[PDB]
Design a protein around this ligand. Structure first.
Ligand SMILES: [Fe+3]
Length: 272
């Protein structure tokens, strides 16, 4: 039976599986579409994690459930995959000053995710070290090749008009890399107050700058974004993918597809 890796959520599953190739099985705890910040694990998840040889998670306070869940797991090592990530801080709300956990939305950060996951796989399954090393380098080259198409895809939005209005403030790392000012209805997924007041502050920012499009994301409700759309007259741009891939048969089966689809959907929103 092959070396088994279990990850907290789907983005890490797909990156690790590319590095693992056919010498290791990598599975996600959270299923596609499920909210990952305050996920409530199930009996299935304990059995799945307990059957793994290694458990990977994001850290940076992403999985608020993980440490309690990991208590119920005996004699399975865990490894965070975000060593060396430079955090962007959350700037408003009850989590101000905590790291924004969504670092994988920058493809240059994905190279660090790859290196950290390569290091963990090699450390815990050294028999397959050269497969992990070969796959990690090959996959890293795939990530590097995205920068040119992605920039070209957004090249038609003039710099002054690059406002990214979303529901969760989950795109800070992507926005910083591609010169977007970010606007959001809540800084991070959580049980929290202040969203109704922030909804009106976003409406003011949209009206002030005549921002033409707003978005929601695949693991949360589209209702706040559509309410903002109706009240401002801005177009509802659809669903961006940050916290989860789709199923393998859906439109966003891989991490590369997530970056491309999100950037494409954004550019579509500004299309004239
Ligand atoms: Fe999130």
């Amino acid at each position: 039976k092959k070396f088994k890796v279990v990850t907290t959520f789907t983005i890490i599953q797909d990156i690790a599986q590319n590095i693992a190739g056919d010498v290791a099985v990598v599975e996600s705890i959270t299923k596609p579409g499920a909210e990952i910040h305050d996920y409530q694990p199930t009996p299935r998840d304990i059995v799945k994690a307990q059957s793994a040889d290694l458990i990977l998670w994001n850290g940076m306070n992403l999985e608020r459930w993980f440490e309690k869940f990991f208590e119920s797991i005996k004699d399975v090592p865990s490894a965070v995959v975000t060593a060396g990530i430079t955090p962007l801080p959350i700037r408003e709300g009850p989590y101000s000053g905590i790291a924004n956990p969504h670092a994988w939305m920058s493809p240059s950060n994905a190279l660090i995710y790859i290196e950290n996951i390569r290091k963990a796989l090699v450390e815990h399954d050294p028999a397959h070290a050269e497969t992990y090393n070969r796959n990690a380098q090959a996959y890293a080259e795939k990530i590097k090749a995205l920068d040119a198409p992605l920039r070209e895809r957004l090249s038609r939005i003039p710099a002054e008009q690059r406002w990214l209005v979303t529901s969760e403030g989950a795109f800070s790392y992507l926005a910083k890399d591609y010169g977007f000012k970010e606007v959001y209805l809540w800084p991070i997924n959580a049980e929290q107050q202040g969203i109704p007041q922030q909804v009106r502050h976003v409406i003011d920012i949209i009206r002030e700058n005549k921002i033409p499009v707003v978005f929601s994301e695949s693991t949360i409700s589209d209702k706040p974004a559509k309410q903002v759309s109706k009240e401002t007259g801005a177009q509802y741009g659809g669903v961006l993918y940050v916290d989860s891939l789709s199923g393998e048969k859906g439109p966003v089966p891989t991490y590369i597809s997530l970056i491309n689809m999100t950037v494409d959907t954004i550019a579509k929103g500004f299309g004239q």
